[PDB]
Amino acid sequence: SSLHPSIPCPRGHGAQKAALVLLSACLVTLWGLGEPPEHTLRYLVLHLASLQLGLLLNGVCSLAEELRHIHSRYRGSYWRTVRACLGCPLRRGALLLLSIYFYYSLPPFTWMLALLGLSQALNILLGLKGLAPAEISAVCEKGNFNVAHGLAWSYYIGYLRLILPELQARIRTYNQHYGAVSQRLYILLPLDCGVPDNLSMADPNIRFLDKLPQQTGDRAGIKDRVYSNSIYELLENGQRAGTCVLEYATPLQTLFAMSQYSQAGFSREDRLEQAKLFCRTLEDILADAPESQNNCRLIAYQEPSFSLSQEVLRHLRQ
Amino acid sequence: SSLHPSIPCPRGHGAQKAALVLLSACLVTLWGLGEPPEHTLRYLVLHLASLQLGLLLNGVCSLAEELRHIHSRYRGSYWRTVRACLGCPLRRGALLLLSIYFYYSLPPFTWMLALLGLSQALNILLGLKGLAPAEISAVCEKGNFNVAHGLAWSYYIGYLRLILPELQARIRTYNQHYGAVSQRLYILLPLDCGVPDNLSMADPNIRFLDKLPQQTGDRAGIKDRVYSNSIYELLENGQRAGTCVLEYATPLQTLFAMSQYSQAGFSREDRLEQAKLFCRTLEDILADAPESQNNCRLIAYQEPSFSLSQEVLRHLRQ
Amino acid sequence: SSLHPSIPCPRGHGAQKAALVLLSACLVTLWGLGEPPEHTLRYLVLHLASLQLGLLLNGVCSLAEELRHIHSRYRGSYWRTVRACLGCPLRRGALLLLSIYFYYSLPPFTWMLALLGLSQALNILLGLKGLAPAEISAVCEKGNFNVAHGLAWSYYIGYLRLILPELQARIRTYNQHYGAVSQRLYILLPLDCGVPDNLSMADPNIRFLDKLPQQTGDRAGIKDRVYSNSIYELLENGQRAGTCVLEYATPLQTLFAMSQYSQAGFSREDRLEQAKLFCRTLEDILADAPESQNNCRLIAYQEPSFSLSQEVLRHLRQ
Amino acid sequence: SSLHPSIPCPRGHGAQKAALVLLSACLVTLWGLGEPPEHTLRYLVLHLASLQLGLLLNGVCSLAEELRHIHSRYRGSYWRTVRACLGCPLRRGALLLLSIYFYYSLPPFTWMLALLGLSQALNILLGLKGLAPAEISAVCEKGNFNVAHGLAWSYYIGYLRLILPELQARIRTYNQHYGAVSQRLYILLPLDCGVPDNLSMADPNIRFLDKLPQQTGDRAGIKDRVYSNSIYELLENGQRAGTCVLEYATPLQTLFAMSQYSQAGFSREDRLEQAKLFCRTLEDILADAPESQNNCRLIAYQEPSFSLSQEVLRHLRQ
Numbered sequence A, B, C, D: 001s002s003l004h005p006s007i008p009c010p011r012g013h014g015a016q017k018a019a020l021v022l023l024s025a026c027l028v029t030l031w032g033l034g035e036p037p038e039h040t041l042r043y044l045v046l047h048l049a050s051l052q053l054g055l056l057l058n059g060v061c062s063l064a065e066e067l068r069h070i071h072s073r074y075r076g077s078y079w080r081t082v083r084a085c086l087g088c089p090l091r092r093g094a095l096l097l098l099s100i101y102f103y104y105s106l107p108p109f110t111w112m113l114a115l116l117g118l119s120q121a122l123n124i125l126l127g128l129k130g131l132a133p134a135e136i137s138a139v140c141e142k143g144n145f146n147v148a149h150g151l152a153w154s155y156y157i158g159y160l161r162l163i164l165p166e167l168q169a170r171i172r173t174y175n176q177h178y179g180a181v182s183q184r185l186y187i188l189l190p191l192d193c194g195v196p197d198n199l200s201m202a203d204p205n206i207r208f209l210d211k212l213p214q215q216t217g218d219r220a221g222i223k224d225r226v227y228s229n230s231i232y233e234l235l236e237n238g239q240r241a242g243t244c245v246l247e248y249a250t251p252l253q254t255l256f257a258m259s260q261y262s263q264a265g266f267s268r269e270d271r272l273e274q275a276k277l278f279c280r281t282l283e284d285i286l287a288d289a290p291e292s293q294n295n296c297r298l299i300a301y302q303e304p305s306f307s308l309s310q311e312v313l314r315h316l317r318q
């Protein structure tokens, strides 16, 4: 979280520690109450069996919908749909057999089955299966089910991986042909996702000077596709203080626009979260990329009395 | 789903219908067993209360972690963390009060609380909270937690929304200055995410003719940023069958690249699913967008003896 | 397994199916014997508890050795060594607490602990912890703990990924400057790992003609490093039948040499297994590589009356 | 371990010493409890018998899978499959007979057999057979199931074994034809697996001078295959401090590339561990090899303000 304090760090294992504490407390309580541990084990196994039966019923309900997509999503394989709706069928079947055995054989099975089915049907019909926001966010981060992930990887693959290697050569060409621009690309990251097309509008102290020699390449059927960069001077008290190849991170614009459109199903809180996740993912990518060797500098900032030029200079002086 | 049969349709409400059938069957079974409805109601309420207590315990365990990211992800408010780990605190508290009342008033409590805590801690520690793939997919599609969503919206907002309005002008200018090219942009959507840099390599019948006039605009500080498109000749039996503005969808490339790098946590099945999702999302956007005044055509194909030129010609002759 | 029938296919899930059958049979037997399921559950839990205690003791024994490598292998972290010797400490501790509870509370703990420690110490001192060859092989394949894996990836990265793209250009140059060599590189894979330096020795029907224009590049501090390929004519009944860019897979030589040297700890059975695994891994890599697009052909063969030239021709004619 | 302190030493016998201590402590505890030794012996034998039965059941489950690969991995002999799934059948049968005899002759059998089968099937289905990382590492190092082993042996057999003998001739030829370069080859071993293509890029003080005479030889059908080495100048304060034949170890590059591709199943921790293992294995090979008549020097370093040229000079001045 060196970019900005507001960047969330990845989740740890606090839930497991709290669960261990809870387990210890529950065991202590059961010991204090002084009840037969045999009954404890019996009822715990029965509870887990009920959970397994509930999973079975919910998966059966979801199977009715998922079979409609058998040819598209699951390649015509019934076993694939079953695995998607229930997980590993072997494990689930073994657990079901064990539950049946330890219920029908321990101190009515069909009545309890009907009751559990009624409860699951109620939970489904009334829309009570929804997870809490924190669990959804954790699942999405673990599985990388985020738009920011794809946006950052697209930014790295399509632009930086094709731009950074030739940046030094282009800079040397511009410097010898013409001034002492720093040998790095400075990428701005406004967590508010406010990305204007002209920096001079955001801060007069930043002023355009010229353009580097255009880079060219063929991309996805389009040939002679050109990437261009701009040179900006940073002023202090009306006098020049630095010069750099500065630009905004274009994908953030998208995050803003997606929040304006209603067809995108994207809100402002999602916008903030995804912008910060984008910054984090891009930092993680660059920290390990061989292309990026002191060639790029990310400047992340959040507007609360704020001067962008001074922010850029605080990094340039280093 | 006119693009390609392999594109899955959005999920419907089959699960709820299955749940209704299950509920009716369970009620019929309970009626047949002849058990008194009051006992059924009591036990159902107790089961729902147990579910609520389990939710509370799991939410506490998750809060133990979220309190760390309080400042960076919840704006320093404990109430937001609680609402994220448990949902609406008012509803949860009401349900907990009702559960306590109807557990103590109906034919111990701390013992079962300890058992439920034990079960929840066991599920957390052993990693049994994992959802089935179908549930995760449904959650992501409903909440738009996919990379394809962002990729498609970026493609529309950064490229098409700026290119389609001015396309006919460039095309007519090229025609006057020189070829009878159709007035429509053609975008290829390979579901295998091939995306070669040279189209002629994919099919010899596809050959370059000339570039349209360049379009220019300022974007994200980079001024005079240039968008260029390429004309292509479609041959049939060694003869000029047609001419069109043709290009691949660049984001697919990214997906492919994301399926190769290990740092992305992206697999090939995820690649195919996200490609289909990207195509469907883009189709919907273009259907609702006003810029797409028949100025674009999407071509989605899946290689099995396949001729890309033939498919493009088929879409052209319409 | 299209290369050769002798190539083993990856392992499936037959063990899990057999385990499910075994579980069903055991449950049926317990039902037939008509003993109290409470006793069954009790003794099953006790057995699992004993297994957990054995794991704890074995991990404690291994910890004494692994602490000597704390600074080198585990970066001075005691928790990392503990996780390496015991797995997730939270889960293991929870299971230990549960085992202690359900043993000391169900119908002497210290005596059984001493007995289990004695048994584990015997198993360690007498070297009885060794796994069977099949389990070791499965573990190595799942974790890619094989020399052939690294050899194949090295062959792809260092040679093919740098050779295939320019192969067509070099072939066209040679053909226009001089005959109609097929536009593919043919790589021989002798599963016996017998790789001579001159093919003419292996089969007179194969005869050297000339060399393609050398490819050049800088690699790992060495500049102007050159890759060269040879052209070979394949004869029939004394008359020419084909011409191709043919070569052996160099890494196989290593596999042979490693079997000759004693310092390598490599046998002939390992040689065969690793050669076949190398072929399989290379095939899997090429099937998904974008560089390989009809540019390479693998010819795997096993000498039992064998003609290499006819083997090459059977692929050339296609 | 003179290369670098971070290189781990081979594992010793600390586990056996800990096991001996544990056994002595357990015997003392049993003596203190005052239990009769005959009961101890009976229960210990029963425990060992249970372990044998579990091994048998797991071996049967694994045989259910290995019978599929019988032809492709065991030469069509069922006895080899049995020996792979169970070990020496004679010893296993003897132990099973003894177990049966001492279980039936000492104070049911089928019931406990069913319980053990249930436990084994449960462990198999739930994936509880996974070894701890330290045990896997020990098994791989003892059996040489690492990629670094093969990479190091390939580096020695393909490059060094063919280059070191003829190095002094080339060096003296270059000296007569022109520079006072040392008579030793210098190999860099970055544990981070950086391996840039240009050394001057890594450190400006490293600059190219000229190439040694090329070495030529026929290899794997490719005749006139060329090995080339490069001389480099080591500067200090802008002055020529030394000249040497310097190069990176190419296989490390491969490791890095394997840590990026997802198809390889190779992580960064595995990358570092395998780099250390490669360095150690190469050191041992060179120590035992006769070609290394002080003709090579290995330089292993780990970047923390680090000057590669200074380290090379330090190794040179000796």
Ligand SMILES: CCCCCCCC/C=C\CCCCCCCC(=O)OC[C@H](COP(=O)(O)O[C@@H]1[C@H](O)[C@H](O)[C@@H](OP(=O)(O)O)[C@H](OP(=O)(O)O)[C@H]1O)OC(=O)CCCCCCC/C=C\CCCCCCCC
Residues within 6 Å of the ligand: A011, A012, A013, A014, A017, A020, A021, A024, A027, A028, C097, C100, C101
């Ligand atoms: C049945 C009746 C008997 C019941 C027995 C009751 C036992 C109750 C047990 C356990 C309580 C668990 C509390 C969790 C620890 C506090 C967490 C924390 O506050 O930690 C505080 C510090 C760590 O702090 P930092 O290092 O600064 O933070 C890190 C860092 O930032 C990483 O970088 C980051 O990421 P990573 O590097 O790890 O990837 C990571 O995050 P992550 O770990 O969440 O992933 C962050 O935690 O540890 C500690 O001193 C705790 C040391 C544990 C001491 C031993 C356990 C207690 C003593 C005895 C227990 C009973 C033993 C059994 C005896 C026999 C039983 C019969």
Ligand SMILES: CCCCCCCC/C=C\CCCCCCCC(=O)OC[C@H](COP(=O)(O)O[C@@H]1[C@H](O)[C@H](O)[C@@H](OP(=O)(O)O)[C@H](OP(=O)(O)O)[C@H]1O)OC(=O)CCCCCCC/C=C\CCCCCCCC
Residues within 6 Å of the ligand: A097, A100, A101, C011, C012, C013, C014, C017, C020, C021, C024, C027, C028
């Ligand atoms: C407590 C008292 C009551 C106890 C109840 C007793 C129940 C006993 C249960 C289960 C026995 C398991 C046997 C395993 C199947 C045979 C394996 C095989 O021989 O299969 C034969 C074929 C598949 O053949 P192929 O497709 O040609 O081969 C593939 C292919 O090549 C893949 O390509 C490859 O790779 P992948 O594509 O999968 O990746 C893969 O390999 P992999 O699967 O190992 O990974 C290869 O198998 O399936 C079948 O017809 C079996 C269909 C199962 C039928 C349903 C189960 C039996 C009916 C009832 C069971 C009880 C139901 C419960 C009722 C209520 C209970 C109260």
Ligand SMILES: Nc1nc(=O)c2ncn([C@@H]3O[C@@H]4COP(=O)(O)O[C@H]5[C@@H](O)[C@H](n6cnc7c(N)ncnc76)O[C@@H]5COP(=O)(O)O[C@@H]3[C@@H]4O)c2[nH]1
Residues within 6 Å of the ligand: A154, A155, A158, A159, A222, A225, A226, A227, A228, A247, A248, A250, A251, A254, B154, B155, B158, B159, B219, B220, B222, B225, B226, B227, B228, B249, B250, B251, B254
């Ligand atoms: N600042 C900046 N200057 C550039 O020249 C540039 N070129 C690309 N990018 C950014 O890299 C990322 C990857 O582009 P990708 O091609 O994968 O998707 C691109 C691409 O599919 C399409 N597109 C954009 N510009 C062009 C273009 N000139 N030609 C063809 N397609 C284009 O629309 C997508 C989104 O573009 P932007 O979202 O505005 O910023 C892109 C993008 O975020 C640039 N960013």
Ligand SMILES: Nc1nc(=O)c2ncn([C@@H]3O[C@@H]4COP(=O)(O)O[C@H]5[C@@H](O)[C@H](n6cnc7c(N)ncnc76)O[C@@H]5COP(=O)(O)O[C@@H]3[C@@H]4O)c2[nH]1
Residues within 6 Å of the ligand: C154, C155, C158, C159, C222, C225, C226, C227, C228, C247, C248, C250, C251, C254, D154, D155, D158, D159, D219, D220, D222, D225, D226, D227, D228, D249, D250, D251, D254
């Ligand atoms: N047939 C053939 N013709 C070639 O020109 C060629 N060049 C490389 N290779 C093979 O690709 C693989 C990757 O080489 P890598 O550099 O990663 O390790 C190489 C490399 O580290 C080193 N080495 C081999 N040749 C050279 C060389 N000319 N210059 C420097 N180092 C070399 O020793 C290792 C093993 O080489 P080979 O095991 O004989 O075959 C190699 C290798 O199997 C070739 N194979």
Ligand SMILES: CC(C)CCC[C@@H](C)[C@H]1CC[C@H]2[C@@H]3CC=C4C[C@@H](OC(=O)CCC(=O)O)CC[C@]4(C)[C@H]3CC[C@]12C
Residues within 6 Å of the ligand: A075, A076, A077, A078, A079, A089, A090, A093, A094, C017
């Ligand atoms: C309720 C319990 C007691 C019984 C569980 C039934 C098992 C016998 C099932 C569950 C998982 C099944 C397997 C899941 C996956 C596959 C892969 C499948 O191959 C395919 O991929 C077919 C689809 C396609 O090729 O598109 C062939 C059947 C098989 C082996 C299935 C065989 C039958 C299995 C073991």
Ligand SMILES: CC(C)CCC[C@@H](C)[C@H]1CC[C@H]2[C@@H]3CC=C4C[C@@H](OC(=O)CCC(=O)O)CC[C@]4(C)[C@H]3CC[C@]12C
Residues within 6 Å of the ligand: A017, C075, C076, C077, C078, C079, C089, C090, C093, C094
């Ligand atoms: C026996 C049972 C009842 C108690 C189990 C003890 C737990 C409290 C232990 C087990 C795992 C431990 C964690 C394992 C990993 C780490 C990471 C560790 O951070 C490091 O990486 C330190 C080493 C380094 O930085 O090199 C700090 C402690 C912590 C959180 C540990 C905190 C204490 C934990 C939770």
Ligand SMILES: COc1cc(C(=O)O)ccc1NCc1ccc(C2(C(C)(C)C)OCC(C)(C)CO2)cc1
Residues within 6 Å of the ligand: A045, A048, A049, A052, A091, A092, A095, A098, A099, A102, B126, B128, C041, C044, D122, D126
């Ligand atoms: C990874 O292992 C697990 C996976 C899953 C899953 O796939 O969801 C669930 C639970 C898993 N392990 C915990 C667990 C498994 C089995 C049992 C058990 C006994 C066998 C104790 C006798 O009692 C309850 C039962 C009758 C229902 C089933 O059998 C208890 C606890």
Ligand SMILES: COc1cc(C(=O)O)ccc1NCc1ccc(C2(C(C)(C)C)OCC(C)(C)CO2)cc1
Residues within 6 Å of the ligand: A041, A044, B122, B126, C045, C048, C049, C052, C091, C092, C095, C098, C099, C102, D126, D128
């Ligand atoms: C992924 O889950 C598992 C992981 C591991 C592992 O880390 O090795 C082992 C076993 C796992 N699940 C199977 C299982 C867990 C727990 C128990 C249980 C009960 C809680 C049934 C009451 O009984 C036995 C016990 C007292 C020893 C522990 O608690 C039975 C079965």
